[PDB]
């Protein structure tokens, strides 16, 4: 959620994702903790005994048939964490995540109700306004002439400025603004 | 392949800014700067009961068929207090085993 | 009422607790700045299992790409802090 995906997943990444998903579905099948630990050790043993192959085509065929087996006998109703996609209370507090620019539209009476907070907010707005030009200059100076450009962003390179495009993720709403 | 120092340093600086912003989200101590047993049962039951009973007695019984009840289930062996019409009981009840 | 808030020290202590109960590593050698493969001697399956244990400890799911980015208990703690908005 915090790192943008690359162009493709490597074979190691696909194997690790399958391993994690298989362990989660195994837990969902064998609910009980000791039984889950037993079968998770068995699954780890299977991955270890197919670990070292030195043949990319054989490894890819093993991965393909392992994904086939996973889709054949996955749990139809797996365990999903709350605050995770597909689970309960996933997008529950999005109705309370107010996007923080409405404080500009707040009345002077309401701003007078919280004076110190709005002084600090004005200081933050001044910092953003002063940092934006150096952010744009650093992004233009980033060596991306043509071709391969990823979704990653650079940090603050010189002393005294801020990472580019910092505002939308520094001033994001809290995960439970209640 | 964990964090390259590029995004590691970016995450560290963004983390420092996020900690400062969340710390600034705290409220000052002065903020926000603002500018008996049975009384509820008397106020919210008795007065509405008075109004409702006025509407029932003097605006429904004054109308013909606004309140209609069924028969009060007369049984054999009681007195009707309207005309003196006590009704006779049933017959000899031949079965009396249970 | 319910749900006491969690701080950086509590997050660090719980992460260190789980890693000390891994039983594969750390014979009084673990620190907060110990890399899982560089100076703890693990591999990718072990790191995936460590992430699974952290998820089961804290009751929420770390997404796969961020999870495979995480390689040290310090940055596990930093990830929990960034997700939960700690030090308000």
């Amino acid at each position: 959620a915090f790192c943008a995906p690359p162009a493709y997943l490597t074979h190691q990444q696909k194997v690790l994702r399958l391993y994690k998903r298989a362990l989660r579905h195994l837990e969902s099948w064998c609910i009980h903790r000791d039984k889950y630990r037993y079968f998770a050790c068995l699954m780890r043993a299977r991955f270890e005994e197919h670990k070292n192959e030195k043949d990319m085509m054989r490894a890819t065929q093993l991965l393909r048939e392992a994904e086939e087996e996973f889709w054949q006998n996955q749990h139809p109703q797996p365990y999903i964490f709350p605050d995770s996609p597909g689970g309960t209370s996933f997008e529950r507090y999005e109705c309370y995540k107010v996007p923080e620019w409405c404080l500009d539209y707040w009345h002077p009476s309401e701003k007078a109700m919280y004076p110190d907070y709005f002084s600090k907010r004005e200081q933050w707005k001044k910092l953003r306004m002063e940092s934006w030009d150096r952010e744009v200059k650093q992004l233009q100076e980033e060596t991306s002439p043509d071709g391969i450009m990823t979704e990653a962003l650079p940090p603050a390179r010189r002393e005294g400025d801020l990472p580019p495009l910092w505002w939308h993720i520094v001033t994001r709403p809290r995960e439970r603004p209640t | 392949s964990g964090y390259t120092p590029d995004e590691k340093l970016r995450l560290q600086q963004l983390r420092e800014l996020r900690r400062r912003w969340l710390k600034d989200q705290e409220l000052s101590p002065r903020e926000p700067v603002l500018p008996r047993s049975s009384l509820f049962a008397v106020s919210h039951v008795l007065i509405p009961m008075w109004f409702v009973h006025y509407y029932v007695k003097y605006h429904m019984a004054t109308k013909p068929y606004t309140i209609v009840s069924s028969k009060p289930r007369i049984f054999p062996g009681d007195t009707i207090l309207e005309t003196g019409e006590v009704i006779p009981p049933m017959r000899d009840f031949p079965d009396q085993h249970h | 009422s319910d749900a006491p808030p969690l701080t950086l020290d509590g997050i660090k202590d719980r992460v260190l607790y789980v890693l000390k109960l891994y039983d594969k590593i750390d014979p009084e050698k673990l620190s907060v700045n110990s890399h899982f493969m560089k100076d703890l001697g693990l591999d990718s399956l072990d790191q995936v299992e460590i992430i699974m244990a952290m998820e089961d400890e804290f009751g929420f799911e770390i997404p796969d790409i961020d999870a495979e980015k995480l390689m040290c208990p310090q940055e596990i703690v930093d990830y929990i802090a960034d997700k939960k908005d700690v030090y308000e």
Binding site: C102, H107, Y117, R174 | - | -
Partner: peptide
């Protein structure tokens, strides 16, 4: 303590 400023829209109008 630890009271946090909840962000709300302008309900004044």
């Amino acid at each position: 303590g630890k009271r946090l400023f909840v962000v709300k829209p302008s309900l004044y109008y």
